[PDB]
């Protein structure tokens, strides 16, 4: 079975460079070029460049020429892509891939390495309760939330009432901004249920050994 093995993720600072690897097995490394492709979050596939592992010669799209440098280590059957002078525009998944016999289509893909660019060190979240504005208890359901702000790196875990309240929950994907992540979560319950009954956001951030239970109190 052909394998193109990539690490799942790398973390790099703005202005630094990073060298991503792609180890080939299950075929003869120097029989085929290695290609590389960028995919920004929610966006399409972009060709970066390719390299001939036997000769070391390379080709690049004009968009990435000079941002990416491709190399190989024949003895370890490994292809490398070095990205230079990183900015937040470089945060994306980077695939290696290998074409078919005649170099027309992409026969095999790596899993892609997520490269995250951030200057932050490990940072504990601030966890804030989100309670409704008073007066307009409206009618039927009430929505509460939890804001988990300014942490680094991923991941966090968030539950409601220690996992007992799981229906009517939306936990939103984290977003990176100014080097730190922010995450939120909503939970919706019948309006007669709260605040007569307690609802609590449980947040853990393993990297900082943070664990917080924030009860949502009417405001």
């Amino acid at each position: 079975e052909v394998q193109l093995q990539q690490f799942g993720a790398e973390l790099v600072k703005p202005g630094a460079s990073v060298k991503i690897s792609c180890k080939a097995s299950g075929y003869t490394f120097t029989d085929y070029n290695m290609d590389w492709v960028k995919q920004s979050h929610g966006k399409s596939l972009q060709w970066i460049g390719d390299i001939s592992p036997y000769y070391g010669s390379t080709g690049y799209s004009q968009k990435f020429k000079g941002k990416a440098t491709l190399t190989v280590d024949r003895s370890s059957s490994t292809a490398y892509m070095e990205l230079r002078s990183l900015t937040s525009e470089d945060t994306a998944v980077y695939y290696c891939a290998r074409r078919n016999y005649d170099g027309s289509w992409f026969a095999y893909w790596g899993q892609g390495t997520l490269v995250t660019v951030s200057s932050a060190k490990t940072t504990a979240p601030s966890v804030y309760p989100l309670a409704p504005v008073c007066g307009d208890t409206t009618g039927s359901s009430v929505t509460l939330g939890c804001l988990v702000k300014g942490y680094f790196p991923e991941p966090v875990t968030l539950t409601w009432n220690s996992g007992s309240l799981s229906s009517g929950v939306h936990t939103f994907p984290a977003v990176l901004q100014s080097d730190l992540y922010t995450l939120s979560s909503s939970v919706t319950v019948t309006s007669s249920t709260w605040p007569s009954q307690s609802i609590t956001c449980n947040v853990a951030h393993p990297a900082s050994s943070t664990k917080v239970d924030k009860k949502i109190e009417p405001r």
């Binding site: 170099g103 893909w109 929505t143 939330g145 702000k149």
Partner: protein, 213 residues
């Protein structure tokens, strides 16, 4: 370079349907187009090569056609696992190039968002910050716009948005939008408004509050 334009950008489908989508090249490329599927969190997977040629291990549901500039991928009898992104790629001329994709999603009935607004917590203000949060939950279709207004004036800086994937239970979408200011900044204004527009919106949905009610 050769430009590939794919259409529609989003296609709403139901299992069992026969559906098709397009890849148009900016010049004649013969039959030198190839199609890939990519499921969420997955790698691309070749489905069709040289416009119409079948690939081992790919279900017969997938078929490609066309030649010249206009290419079509057809899925006869869509299945839930076909909900994915689809890309075309040309090998006529160096450099290879890719289309920007067609995304499949599941069709359901229109649903208006449930919109909730949340002033900053006393805990955050005490620490010197002020995030105002707006949840827009369980809507369909997926496209939605959110505006923040402070004292009636639109504000675009300091906003962070997050969108969920299509819900595997009811096929809706949800959105979180957070406007973050400093405490001092926050305390210079009175009204805060999250205003949403959507297909379902006869009037924009307005959720607001005053710091001085």
């Amino acid at each position: 370079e050769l430009v590939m334009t794919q259409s529609p950008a989003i296609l709403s489908v139901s299992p069992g349907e026969r559906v098709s989508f397009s890849c148009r090249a900016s010049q004649i490329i013969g039959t030198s187009i190839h199609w890939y599927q990519q499921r969420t969190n997955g790698s691309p997977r070749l489905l069709i090569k040289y416009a119409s040629e079948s690939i081992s291990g790919i279900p017969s549901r997938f078929s490609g056609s066309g030649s010249g500039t206009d290419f079509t991928l057809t899925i006869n009898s869509v299945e839930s696992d076909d909900i994915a992104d689809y890309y075309c790629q040309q090998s006529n001329s160096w450099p290879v190039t890719f289309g920007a994709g067609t995304k499949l999603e599941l069709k359901r009935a229109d649903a208006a968002p449930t919109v909730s607004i949340f002033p900053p917590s006393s805990e955050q203000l005490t620490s010197g910050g002020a995030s105002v949060v707006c949840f827009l939950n369980n809507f369909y279709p997926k496209d939605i716009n959110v505006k923040w207004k402070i004292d009636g004036s639109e504000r675009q800086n300091g906003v962070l948005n997050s969108w969920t994937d299509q819900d595997s239970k009811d096929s809706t979408y949800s959105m979180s939008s957070t406007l973050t200011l400093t405490k001092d900044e926050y305390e210079r204004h009175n009204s805060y408004t999250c205003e949403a527009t959507h297909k379902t919106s006869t009037s924009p949905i307005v959720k607001s509050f005053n710091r001085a009610a």
